Amino acid sequence: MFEARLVQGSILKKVLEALKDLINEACWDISSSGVNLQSMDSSHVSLVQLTLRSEGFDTYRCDRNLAMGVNLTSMSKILKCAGNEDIITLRAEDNADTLALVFEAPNQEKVSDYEMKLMDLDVEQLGIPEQEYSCVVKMPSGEFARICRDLSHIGDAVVISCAKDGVKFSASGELGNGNIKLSQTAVTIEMNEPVQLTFALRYLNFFTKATPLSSTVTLSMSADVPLVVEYKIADMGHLKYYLAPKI
């Protein structure tokens, strides 16, 4: 059997909100180490990767590895029927046609169970190579979301450039151009070499849907490698977004 009890069920509500406008469907790969999900968006310009470790769950059982194909729009809809304070239990047999989700209200006296039809996906999970980064910027997630939003009103693409003391975000369009300069004094930059990279704001603004998960975000960057936008989840894992260079 697979069964996982998460007392902070709002983690999963927020995860699915952070996934469902970027990707339609995905395999939830359940093993004894936890839950992993990896999926490119339909344009193939970006990739999301979700890790929720077993020790993050209050109870966790998984007797056999499962790969559960899930329509994320449907899973979202189910998770909407959960309040922010609810304990959520995921349950599935080893040969699963459905996912059970059980929401236990806090004030109590209210229990909801939902049974979601799974789907067949035949996806090819290629590897993410563990890279080295010229610049890693750690910043407030609210501030990054605001920047991606504001700049998307000026143009299509952000030029992210980084150096010892600070990081700069620039865009340009028909109306003119803009630069936002953030200095390190909570902004934190560990940079071995300077970088100047261009990326599509349309995808970054899907990424920032994950902002509720963490008050900080890290941007890892080099020439010739995808950008990683990482949001830690509590004490239990992360959502990582990968974005090809805007060409």
Partner: peptide, 10 residues
């Protein structure tokens, strides 16, 4: 080709 995540995988 380089604007696609495929290019960077495996």
């Amino acid at each position: 080709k380089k604007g696609l995540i495929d290019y960077y995988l495996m």
